Each structure stands twice: as structure tokens, then as C-alpha cells.
Amino acid sequence: TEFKAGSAKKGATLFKTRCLQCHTVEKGGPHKVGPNLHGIFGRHSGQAEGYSYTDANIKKNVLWDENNMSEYLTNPKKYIPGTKMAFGGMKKEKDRNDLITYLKKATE
Ligand code: HEC
Numbered sequence: 001t002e003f004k005a006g007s008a009k010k011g012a013t014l015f016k017t018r019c020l021q022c023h024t025v026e027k028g029g030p031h032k033v034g035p036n037l038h039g040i041f042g043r044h045s046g047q048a049e050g051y052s053y054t055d056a057n058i059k060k061n062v063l064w065d066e067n068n069m070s071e072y073l074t075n076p077k078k079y080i081p082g083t084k085m086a087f088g089g090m091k092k093e094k095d096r097n098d099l100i101t102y103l104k105k106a107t108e
Contacts, residue, residue, distance in 0.1 A: 002067060003066040003070050003097065004097050005097065005101050006097035006099075006100075006101040007101065008101050008102045009102075010098040010101075011098040011099045011100070011101045012106075014098055014099040014102065015099060015102055015103070019034075019087075019099075021033070022034035022085075023035065023036065023037055024036040025037050025038060025103070025107050026106075031050060031051045037107050040064050041064055041065065041066070041104060041107060042064065043064055044061050044062060044063050044064070045060055045064065046058035046060075046061070054083055054084050055082065056082030057080055057085075060079075060080045060083075062079075066100050066104060069100055070097075073087075073096050073100075074089050074090065074091065074096070075089040076089065
């Protein structure tokens with residue numbers, strides 16, 4: 001309801017510049033500092049196997065959807081206190097609409 005589709009292309013580049021240092025999105029891509037994100041939409045938090053999540057992420061048990069994700073990306077630490085995801089956040093909803101739009105396509 002509060003997530004509007006943006007530019008997948010724009011979102012692709014946001015990812016490269018803000019998420020690529022610690023994550024992969026491809027099916028068969030490895031975990032790095034952060035878990036590979038393929039198929040994240042529809043799954044709950046802390047369920048990628050072979051990855052050592054914090055107690056926080058796990059217990060938060062977030063069901064990932066375009067909407068939740070938006071709030072998460074605004075300020076991960078405020079959303080999941082104790083998370084070791086060291087990203088400050090994405091304040092512009094347009095920047096977030098663009099990235100989730102990319103994510104929504106590339107992690108499927
Ligand atoms: C390293 C400096 C990171 C950057 C940059 C980004 N993320 Fe990340 N993320 C990182 C870690 C170590 C973890 C695991 C957290 C824990 O507490 O165990 C995460 C987690 C996520 C999640 C949750 C995944 C789950 O399976 O529940 C998501 C949805 C996620 N990361 C997405 C993501 C995006 C889109 C980013 C770019 C804007 C990004 N993160 C940055 C480490 C790092």
C-alpha cells in the first residue's frame with residue numbers, strides 16, 4: 001500500500017553502490033558478509049542456510065515483503081535492534097522504491 005514501483009535500472013545501480021559490498025542476489029550466489037538474498041521475498045528473516053545470523057534478526061522473524069523491506073531499509077538497526085547489518089539507511093522513499101523494484105525482480 002505504501003510501496004510504489006520505480007526504476008529497476010535505477011534500483012540495479014543503487015544495489016551495486018549500497019548493497020554489493022556485502023550481498024549477492026543471484027540464485028547460486030554465495031553468502032559474503034551478508035546472506036545471499038535470492039528468494040528473500042515471502043521468506044522470514046534468519047532462514048538462509050549456512051549463514052550465521054544474529055539472535056536479533058532471527059527473533060524478529062520478519063516476513064519479507066516490498067513493504068516491510070521499505071521500513072527496514074529506512075533504518076535497519078531501528079527495525080531490528082542488535083542486527084549486525086552495518087548500513088545507515090536509505091532515507092528517500094523514491095531511492096527505496098527504485099531498489100525494492102530491482103530486488104523484487106532479481107531475487108525471484
Ligand atoms: C555490509 C556493510 C552490509 C551492507 C552494505 C548491507 N547489508 Fe544487508 N545484511 C548484512 C548482514 C551482516 C546481515 C545479517 C544480519 C544479522 O543480524 O544476522 C544483513 C541482513 C540483511 C537482510 C535480512 C536477510 C534475512 O535473510 O533475514 C536484508 C533483507 C538485507 N540485508 C538487505 C540489504 C540491502 C538491500 C542492502 C543495500 C541497501 C544491504 N542489506 C546492505 C550486511 C550488509
